[PDB]
Amino acid sequence: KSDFKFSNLLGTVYRQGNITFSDDGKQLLSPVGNRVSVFDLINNKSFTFEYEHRKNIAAIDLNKQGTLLISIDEDGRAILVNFKARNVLHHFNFKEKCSAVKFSPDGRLFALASGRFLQIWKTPDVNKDRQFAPFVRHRVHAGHFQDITSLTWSQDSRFILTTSKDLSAKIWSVDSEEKNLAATTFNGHRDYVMGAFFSHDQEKIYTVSKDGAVFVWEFTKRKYSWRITKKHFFYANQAKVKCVTFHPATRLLAVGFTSGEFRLYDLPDFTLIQQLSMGQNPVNTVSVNQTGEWLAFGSSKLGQLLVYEWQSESYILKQQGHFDSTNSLAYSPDGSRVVTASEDGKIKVWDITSGFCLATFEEHTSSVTAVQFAKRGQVMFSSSLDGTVRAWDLIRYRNFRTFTGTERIQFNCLAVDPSGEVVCAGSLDNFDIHVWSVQTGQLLDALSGHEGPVSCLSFSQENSVLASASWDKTIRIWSIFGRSQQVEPIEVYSDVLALSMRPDGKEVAVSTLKGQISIFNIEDAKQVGNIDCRKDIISGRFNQDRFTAKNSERSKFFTTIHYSFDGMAIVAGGNNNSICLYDVPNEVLLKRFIVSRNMALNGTLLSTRKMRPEVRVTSVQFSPTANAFAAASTEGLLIYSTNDTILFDPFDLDVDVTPHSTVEALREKQFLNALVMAFRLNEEYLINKVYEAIPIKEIPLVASNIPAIYLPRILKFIGDFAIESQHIEFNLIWIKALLSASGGYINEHKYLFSTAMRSIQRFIVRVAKEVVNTTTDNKYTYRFLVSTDGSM
């Protein structure tokens, strides 16, 4: 019963376009295909704008005021968005592919590189209300005979330098009166001109070409005219200049070469500050910080992004996304970390809070089909098409064990015992489930009985029963543990594609090729509910299709399903353009999400294969924090969260309940009532007010007297609040009071408080413990130094 909104995209950090530093220098804007991701370098946080383009983004720029961001796609369609509020402002079409966009340093005007034509337009006022037709063109310039490679603004907002494919750099005057001041075309380059820049004093102009030559231009007598006083050359053996940037204040030239290496130079002396290689792929984009200490690099081929502090020779950011689509995803049991698997065969570990890749594994030769954690969470297991199942420690980041069949059986699904001692994997060719011993690595036995390939597997977290599904049109429940072995087959109407296990372990859901989600009672093996999905799914006609989408039967089934940890919801995904969230007890659709709207993706709307990328979702899972769910898709890992909570979703209001009324109860020292009243209103700001205003002395009194119904909610609030809050001791006092007073009730109903209490454990473990670990060693380190005898 919660509202999920797209928050961020993990697994992809840069796809193409120009990266730009925020004016404050603390944030980096990386264009990610159809959207743009913003990274908080200082706070080490990341998020993605919700607004999206029709086609992959081409260019972006943010104003020095930091209020406006412009994004233009390959079709020239421009989207204007308020940076601060993250809301779209206006939609416009410039009707031509815009190579680059740059705001004037004043911010009043911005320039667009359109073919061989330069356009200068006026910036709308953010303060003014929404305008129907805000954009007005200041001027258009037609000097170049070929496409404009790039453009550079003067520091005074009076001149703009453009480098075009005519082997010519051409300067302009923003003011018509100042046309005589700057109406020069600079020639001499032997190859395409990449970048023209102004000196800080602006007397000197530096021009750079793809061949790797830098010309220094000065206005001097031979009466006065521009001349090439000095010439420099990049003597790269074969690498060609791909991107160039200049920082006039500190005189830095950062150049990315096509070989995949960049050089840092000091002008005009041409001193090579440093040279480094980020790989064999070309360096596509380079941007420089406002202060000039941080230099960011982007290569599209492997989707690489790196932020470099050349001052200290340190890496602020070093992140690279999957080359292939993410085949599967799995959250850490606490939800702090998520692991992703791609068709390449490489596994990457991501942190939810930071949104950054901590480590990557390359051991698997072929595509990794599935990934899963043990109940304890220290260990992660994976199965790949190469014919191996590999066990990974996430504390020490090592593959401590590998499992394989006798004949190198291809594995497509995997499941792990809650005890973390038995593993079961399934194959699309062998029809039999292989079982290994985690401790020993030997094949215990093979669970046979399926007349079809085993599509998916799962262990009950509590009962430890195994449920297996296939294209056999049946489900089999295996009681592997115990002196006696048994199999319980249940028949289903159609081929099974996906299976999810109830955290209680009493029910199982299965998705069939007919487009049905059927739920069965494990202990009895009878159906308990059935949900339709065929109508709800949205599938777009492919460009190659010769048959209509409505008549199409390509994908009206969900290839991945999972429950909510509370146990009342299912999120389902498949080879389609939709994510559907259902409400299990009564079989209805809660909400539906459009995974993508990129026109490039095929499903959005005799010698050669007509294959083009298509929108599809490989896997879906809920957050153990019960506030988000993530879906693996072609573009990357989409995460939808309920964090913002702008909705007013009260519980048990009465006329007496009012935000104003609550405050007197605080003023009237009636803390218990104020807390209960605030929860009834269910407003975070009011709850936070009451929570922080309760004195420490009265906490045990309030905790003992809280009604049972509000106990799960308050516990969830503290856990979610504490993980980022600074009042650990205040929070830790609250949990001690709550656990001491109501712990017995929690034990009586473990499932009701499962999600909330897990968040509490995360706070106690992932931050609180680290504090004492740093505190305790200092104490012992202290004692040794004082107690130990000093050296001779």
Binding site: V136, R137, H141, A183, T184, T185, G188, S225
Partner: peptide, 29 residues
């Protein structure tokens, strides 16, 4: 000249040459 004049609903309301020494390069050749 050198700036396009377009009369459109969105607009239309209202050279120096520098180059390298090629003759010296050619004389070098």
């Amino acid at each position: 000249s050198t700036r396009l004049k377009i009369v459109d609903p969105y607009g239309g309301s209202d050279e120096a040459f520098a180059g390298d020494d090629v003759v010296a390069e050619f004389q070098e050749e």
